[PDB]
Amino acid sequence: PQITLWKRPLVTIKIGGQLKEALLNTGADDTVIEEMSLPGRWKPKMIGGIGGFIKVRQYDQIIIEIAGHKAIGTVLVGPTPVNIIGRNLLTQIGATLNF
């Protein structure tokens, strides 16, 4: 699709068997989802931006379906205000910014 930017670019995702809404965020290095269970081992991480830092769990090799496009990568889980799809998964679905 071509997504204009008049409104927040929200899409439906499927992760861990759950449907969620998430923000396509070219300003995020990483993908960050609100609290949920995921399989495998994890390690703690601190991630920052406006307002400072939050602590998250880092899970590797997680499959995600983003607006119908499957991708695999690292997913961070923690107390984010909004579910965020970052560049690590945007690249995998072929997303580009065009102007």
Binding mask 57-86 for ligand 2NC (x = CB under 6 A): -----------------------xxx-x-x
Query: Are 75 and 13 in contact, with CB atoms under 8 Å apart?
Result: no
Find the shortest distance in angstroms from Cβ 18 to ligand 2NC. Answer: 19
| Dist CA 60 CA 51 (whole Å) | 26
Shortest reach from residue 64's CB to a second copy, in Å: 14
State how beta strands 69-77 and 32-33 pair.
Answer: parallel
Among 15, 47, 62, 75, binds a second copy (CB under 8 A): 47
Q: DSSP 3-state assignment of 92? A: coil
Residue 35 C-beta-side C-alpha neighbours within 13 Å: 3
Determine if 29 is a binding residue for ligand 2NC (CB under 6 A): yes
Cα distances from 23 to residues 15, 40, 41, in angstroms, run 14, 25, 26
Q: Is 97 in the site for ligand 2NC (CB under 6 A)?
A: no
* Binding residues vs a second copy (CB under 8 A): 1-6, 8-9, 23-29, 32, 47-54, 67, 69, 80-81, 84, 87, 90-91, 93-99
